Design a protein around this nucleic acid. Structure first.
Lengths: 108, 34, 81, 49, 92, 91
DNA sequence: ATATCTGACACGTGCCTGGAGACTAGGGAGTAATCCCCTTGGCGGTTAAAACGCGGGGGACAGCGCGTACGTGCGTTTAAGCGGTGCTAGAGCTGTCTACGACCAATTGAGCG
DNA sequence: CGCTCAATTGGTCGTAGACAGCTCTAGCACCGCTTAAACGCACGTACGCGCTGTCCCCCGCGTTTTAACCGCCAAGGGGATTACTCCCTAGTCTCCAGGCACGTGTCAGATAT
């Protein structure tokens, strides 16, 4: 037996692969979990979360801010059609709505 | 300049002493007439 | 008393309308909106209570309503679950 | 907090005739020397208490 | 007692893109909600795929397929590429 | 003039806090719960999760009603624009 | 037979949930002024509407054959517990900076000429 | 037809709240390592119901010229906005008070060391 380290580190991964391996069995999704499946799901969750976290940081950068709030997260969704589709059934607490006007409202 | 290094303590410390005091003093005590 | 759902005030409904981006608002719209607002709770509180009645608790949790909102297709973040 | 003001009105005044105590919340250290007399409406199962 | 959530891990991943940036407690809750919603979507989709195949095993190919029903755009193939990289590097 | 309401749009679209008064909403939530069933009581977080879902739902209804009125060549909403916005959604 | 155990069964205080009272002062409700709107309703350049004569191809066979299904072989798959022990949230507390308040400037909408 | 004026949107100062690195704790399921279950990938082996061109009439289409209708013109008068006037209830924060949970209680009377 040896001094422990995360299985994610050998996979090249940033989230806890061990508890993903727990959740995939303990949630009764199948009788067996393949050795790659929790590594793969951690990689998928990380990839998609990092992709939206750049848009979150960029939404704060656009508003010239340094601390993320739910408004920057709503702006991150409304800056990308993949997120506008994926999160189309999602409510963001205190995120508000994208500011928009139909041209008919405008004077002249 | 140099005073802020102390203010960052003493501005809070005067508030601690005051809050301790105000806690501790509770903690130790028509018509008519005929 | 003000229990006739008129406690959801005219300027509050009008502010929701303004965030919603609508221009001129006819004076029956506030009351038509109060009708929708009741019916939304007749879906959401009712099913949230069916999740409270899964455990048969006295306390409604944020989980109980998030499960009702999930089966009704209007999921919510920040509260978890 | 409540255990103070009721004692502070029973000591140092003649305004009250009588006080109600449980044998176990009242029995320890309160020193109600304004009282002349005591009635045990109940004795405890543990003697000397 | 612990309550199963990703608060420190999403703030660890933020350094991939914006080391300059802080996270409000509210925003931390939103991103904690995001990662577990995508888990409930993928774990359900992969289990329904496994049910249609009657298999005892979930696999890299159940999730590779489930991600393609999660997203229409090429972020699906990039996430699928990242999963196949990670499983390869883990098993080598 | 009759049009500077367009500045209110931009202010309440910049703003992102909840708009209905918490006490009125909590009273209504409790009243609807109590005539539904006995001794149901709500954590503050449940009333907030309800109110956020309600106000997001009504912002969606008003956006949908806006497009119905714009489609009808109006600059005004009448209860009939909401009744289209319900039937066209299947609500 | 005996030591002493597992209820009987209660009031100790902790926690937070949860209610109602008295205050300010935020904001909701009542209203004209008046404009400007949803709406009523004739106008003729433009396409819904349906035959006749007709072009594009829908339709029903016969049977070839690149793939599809069963369901057992056999060696490779994950299961499975339980050793160690690093991660992990609690959580206690800053130590400020960051977004949100308080005072007043560049730029806009309104008035009609 | 482009000014003067009465008001914001946006700018600088302010102040303490709401973060995020500690600063460790110590609870635990992650990671290691054998043990052991049973079926996954392999894979023949039954034999096929998608596609390949014959024979024959069906449906879609172009063309034509009525005549309903949408896009448009302007005006009609009542109801939404802009703004002032005044009344109340949303929020503050307070103390009251009680259900859930934990814990000592204890000694009795039901059970066994």
């Amino acid at each position: 037996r040896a001094k422990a380290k995360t299985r994610s580190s050998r996979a090249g991964l940033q989230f806890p692969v061990g508890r993903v391996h727990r959740l995939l069995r303990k949630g009764n999704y199948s009788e067996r979990v393949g050795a790659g499946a929790p590594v793969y799901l951690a990689a998928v969750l990380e990839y998609l979360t990092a992709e939206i976290l750049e848009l979150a940081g960029n939404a704060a950068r656009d508003n010239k801010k340094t601390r993320i709030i739910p408004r920057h997260l709503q702006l991150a969704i409304r800056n990308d059609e993949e997120l506008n589709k994926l999160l189309g059934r999602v409510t963001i607490a205190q995120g508000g709505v994208l500011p928009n006007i139909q041209a008919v409202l405008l004077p002249k | 300049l140099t005073e802020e290094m102390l203010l960052k303590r003493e501005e809070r410390a005067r508030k601690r002493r005051l809050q301790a005091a105000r806690r501790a003093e509770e903690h130790k005590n028509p018509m008519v007439r005929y | 008393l003000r229990d006739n759902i008129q406690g959801i005030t005219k300027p509050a409904i009008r502010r929701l309308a303004r965030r919603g981006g609508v221009k001129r608002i006819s004076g029956l719209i506030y009351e038509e909106t109060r009708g929708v607002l009741k019916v939304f709770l007749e879906n959401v509180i009712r099913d949230a209570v069916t999740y409270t009645e899964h455990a048969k608790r006295k306390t409604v949790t944020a989980m109980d309503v998030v499960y009702a909102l999930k089966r009704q297709g209007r999921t919510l973040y920040g509260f978890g679950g | 907090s409540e255990r103070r003001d009721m004692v502070a009105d029973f000591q140092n005044r003649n305004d009250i005739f009588v006080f109600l105590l449980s044998t176990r919340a009242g029995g320890l250290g309160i020193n109600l020397t304004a009282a002349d007399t005591v009635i045990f409406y109940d004795s405890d199962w543990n003697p000397t208490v | 007692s612990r309550k199963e959530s990703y608060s420190i891990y999403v703030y660890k991943v933020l350094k991939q893109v914006h080391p300059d940036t802080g996270i409000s407690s509210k925003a931390m809750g939103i991103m904690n909600s995001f990662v577990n919603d995508i888990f409930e979507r993928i774990a359900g989709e992969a289990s329904r795929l496994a049910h249609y195949n009657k298999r005892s095993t979930i696999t890299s190919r159940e999730i590779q397929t489930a991600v393609r029903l999660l997203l229409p755009g090429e972020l699906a193939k990039h996430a699928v590429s990242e999963g196949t990289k990670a499983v390869t590097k883990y098993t080598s | 003039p009759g049009t500077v309401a367009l500045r209110e749009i931009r202010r309440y679209q910049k703003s992102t806090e909840l708009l209905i008064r918490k006490l009125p909403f909590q009273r209504l939530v409790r009243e609807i719960a109590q005539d539904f069933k006995t001794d149901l009581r709500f954590q503050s977080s449940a009333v907030m999760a309800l109110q956020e879902a309600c106000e997001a739902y009504l912002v969606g209804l008003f956006e949908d009603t806006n497009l119905c009125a714009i489609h009808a060549k109006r600059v005004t909403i009448m209860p009939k624009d909401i009744q289209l916005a319900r039937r066209i959604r299947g609500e």
